[PDB]
Amino acid sequence: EVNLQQSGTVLARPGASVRMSCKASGYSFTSYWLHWIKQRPGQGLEWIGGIYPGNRDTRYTQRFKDKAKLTAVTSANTAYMELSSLTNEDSAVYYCSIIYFDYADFIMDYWGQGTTVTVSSAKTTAPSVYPLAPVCGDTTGSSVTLGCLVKGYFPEPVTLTWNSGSLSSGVHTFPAVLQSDLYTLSSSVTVTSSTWPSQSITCNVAHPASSTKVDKKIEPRGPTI
Amino acid sequence: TKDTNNNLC
Amino acid sequence: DIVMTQTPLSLPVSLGDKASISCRSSQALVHSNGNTYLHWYLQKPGQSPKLLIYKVSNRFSGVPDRFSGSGSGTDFTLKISRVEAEDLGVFFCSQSTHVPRTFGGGTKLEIKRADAAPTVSIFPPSSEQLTSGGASVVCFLNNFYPKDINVKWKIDGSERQNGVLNSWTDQDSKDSTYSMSSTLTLTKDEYERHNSYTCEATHKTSTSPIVKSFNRNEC
């Protein structure tokens, strides 16, 4: 038991105010303090505040004092954090955490999944999924290496997979790089020259931020055409 | 009871 | 805030070896109730930090015995008696005996292994992309070691330094090796005007740079 489900990725426009939730279960939501923490991409963890659901009593560090508003719905075991007047700095990943070490047979240190926020005035953009294959039958011997390029998309979350996750071996997905308001991901998979092209290999890409669900397929080819 | 970190106080 | 200072900030270890991280605080961590709430987490990339040891020496459930906690007042130490590929991540020490709960800067444990030369692969623009007016050439330099590498895009023999996207993957929990994709982008037009496309990387493993290339419109 004990699990904190947080709300999914949020895109916000500077000056706006997001609102995220964290649903707790497995312990008495009304009896302990729940902490909210921000992990700016640059590793370091920093505590924002905490709230006692039971009596709705809060606590915030001087910084987040005018930047965060904690709230909780006890009948729903759900706490809410709301960041106001957003900026570039407000971009980080926020976790909700529950700690308790005073009872031996009931130690609690659990974290939510994290609610990644992206503060940008930028506009959503579906990705361009291009399969990547070797021209002609030029195989190193034993293995071939296919690829998939995903580019020109925003916001940051993208779900690349191979043969619907049935291909977990020999794959490498590289971090999305941002190139002026637009991301780019790529991934390679390495199978034996015996499998492909005799056995299909597909690259399944999804960009939920714009409901895109592409299934590009790596077909063999010839001299750049 | 308990602190803001759930400790007995 | 009570400052948690860790050291070393980067930690090179071979497998099987032993390691230690030291954590220290601005003020004592002994709570009025007599407990010392100093814990150590391990954050894997992309996942939330996870508890390893609470109240200086207590190991959380499932944590291997390889981990030990010790320390007092203001000076604390985490120890890995034996290092395995799983240990890959950043280790933090935290404080919950005072408000605010605070954390150290972190300590990236970097594995050491034998050397491995990258596996290069060049991929010509796709028909689907060319139609759009662009030509992204891609090079994958897979499973190499160490992390020190540089790739070169020599179009017709000339060092193209423009429109190249490099992205690396963290050290692998399987290989303890790295990978990266260099990606050169031209216009269909520019792409058309040249015949040779070379991706060559200089990496420890070889005195002669690893070269990979293709002649446009040929096998």
DSSP state of B5: T
H or E segment to which residue B9 belongs: none
Residue C94 CB-half CA count within 13 A = 27
> Which method resolved this structure?
X-ray
Which two tokens mark A202? 């597909």
Cis peptide before A155 (omega within 30 of 0): yes
List chain C residues with CB under 8 Å of A60: none
List chain C residues with CB under 8 Å of B2: none
Instruction: Locate the domains of chain A by residue range.
Output: 1-121, 122-220
The DSSP string of chain C is: ---EEEE-SEEEEETT--EEEEEEESS--B-TTS-B-EEEEEEPTTS---EEEETTTEEPTT--TTEEEEEETTEEEEEESS--GGG-EEEEEEE-SSSS-EE----EEEEE---B--EEEEEPPPHHHHTTTEEEEEEEEEEEBSS-EEEEEESSSSB--SSEEEEEE---TTTS-EEEEEEEEEEHHHHHT-SEEEEEEEETT-SS-EEEEEETT--
Q: Is the dihedral of CA C22, C23, C28, C34 positive or negative?
A: negative
Quick one: which of C156, C158, C163, C159 has its CA closest to C215? C156
Judge whether C93 and C23 are in contact, CB under 8 Å.
Answer: yes
Residue A155: CB atoms within 10 Å: 21
* Resolution reading in Å: 2.6
Chains in touch with C (3+ beta-carbon pairs under 8 Å) read: A, B
Distance between CA atoms of residues C219 and C216, nearest Å:
8
Could you tell me which residues are beta bridge partners of residue C103? Answer: C94
Q: Do domains A1-121 and A122-220 have the same CATH topology?
A: yes
The CA distances from residue C112 to C92, C136, C177, in Å, are: 21, 34, 9
The DSSP string of chain A is: --EEEE---EEE-TT----EEEEEESS-TTTS-EEEEEE-SSS-EEEEEEEEGGGTEEEE-TTGGGTEEEEEEGGGTEEEEEE-S--STT-SEEEEEEEE-SSTT--EEEE---EEEEE-S---B--EEEEE--BTT---BSEEEEEEEEEEEBSS--EEEETTTT--TTEEEEEEEE-SS-EEEEEEEEEETTTTTTS--EEEEEEGGGTEEEEEE---B-TT-
Judge whether A167 and A137 are in contact, CB under 8 Å.
Answer: no
Quick one: which of C207, C9, C12 has its CA closest to C117? C207
Distance between CA atoms of residues C3 and C6, nearest Å:
10
Pairing mode, strands A34-39 and A78-83: unpaired
Cβ contact, residue pair B5, C35, below 8 Å: no
- State the fold for domain A122-220: Immunoglobulin-like (2.60.40)
Burial annotation A12-31 (CB, 10 A radius, 16+ → b, else e): beeeeebebbbbbeebebee
Burial of A200 per CB tally in 10 Å (0-12, 13-18, 19+): exposed
List chain C residues with CB under 8 Å of A128: 129, 132
Contacts of C50 (CB under 8 A, 6+ apart): A111, C41, C42, C43, C44
Judge whether C106 and C97 are in contact, CB under 8 Å.
Answer: no
Domains of chain C (ranges plus CATH)? 1-113 (2.60.40.10), 114-216 (2.60.40.10)
Cβ contact, residue pair B9, C33, below 8 Å: yes
Distance from CA of B5 to the nearest CA of A (A): 7
C-alpha distance across the termini of chain A, in Å: 55
Residue A43 touches partner C, C-beta closer than 8 Å: yes
A residues 86-145 near C, CB within 8 Å?
95, 99, 101-102, 107, 109, 111-114, 128, 130-138, 145
CA angle C212, C214, C217 (to 5 degrees): 170
Residues found in chain A: 225
Contacts of A24 (CB under 8 A, 6+ apart): A2, A3, A4, A34, A77, A78, A79, A96, A98
Residue corresponding to tokens 């997979």? A161
Contacts of A174 (CB under 8 A, 6+ apart): A185, A186, A187, C167, C168, C169, C179, C180, C181
- State the fold for domain A1-121: Immunoglobulin-like (2.60.40)
List chain C residues with CB under 8 Å of A222: 219
